[PDB]
Design a binder for this molecule. Sequence first.
Ligand SMILES: [Cl-]
Ligand SMILES: [Cl-]
Ligand SMILES: [Cl-]
Lengths: 123, 123
Amino acid sequence: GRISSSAIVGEGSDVGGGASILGVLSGTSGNAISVGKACLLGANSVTGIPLGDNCIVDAGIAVLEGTKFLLKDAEELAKLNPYFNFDKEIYKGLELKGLNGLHFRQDSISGAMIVALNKKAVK
Amino acid sequence: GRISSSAIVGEGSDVGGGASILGVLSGTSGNAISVGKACLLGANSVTGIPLGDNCIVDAGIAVLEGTKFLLKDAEELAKLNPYFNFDKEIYKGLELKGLNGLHFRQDSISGAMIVALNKKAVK
Ligand SMILES: [Cl-]
Ligand SMILES: [Cl-]
Ligand SMILES: [Cl-]
């Protein structure tokens, strides 16, 4: 897939067929996008935020700065991300930037965008 | 409708046919339920939390301590409820207790439970 200027992809990551990684976050002090180690970006996905290590974006999913996600697995994600405040239920893409062990997926019954634990990231 | 022991209903309120108002909130320091002035509780609704003034519970809706609601009209609700923090998008019934101008309804297309502005409460 496509790595825009300023975007950095970490060791062991897999950028799937036709995936997009955008380069620079929106705004005036909009910073560069980095994807961490061992991230898996699905075919035809779009990654518009920085991701930490061991994150998964399912095929077809667009993870943009303003996309809202329903958080699942808060207790396990807290362990991988001890400074982050997992107090609420809905987060914008931009709020989740740089976190480790995230799994972005769509609930195929309800249609909701979810941010959950990458089960492999605990181990 | 049905007013349980410890429940108080304020002036000008209308308790619709078969509505339930519960009396005491759950737990050990579980406090009594009060509905404020000019509240409208729909037929066959259930009110399980304290409500402030000018609140509306649509017919058929159950507003329980643990029910989650999607907040709409945050800026206008902030005006009626200046100390409350409308920072997030999803609130449990119990978190919303005692607030003024709330309108509890169901989104009939998405099926989501909503807490919104009672349009009459601004005026
Ligand atoms: Cl393509
Ligand atoms: Cl009845
Ligand atoms: Cl929320």
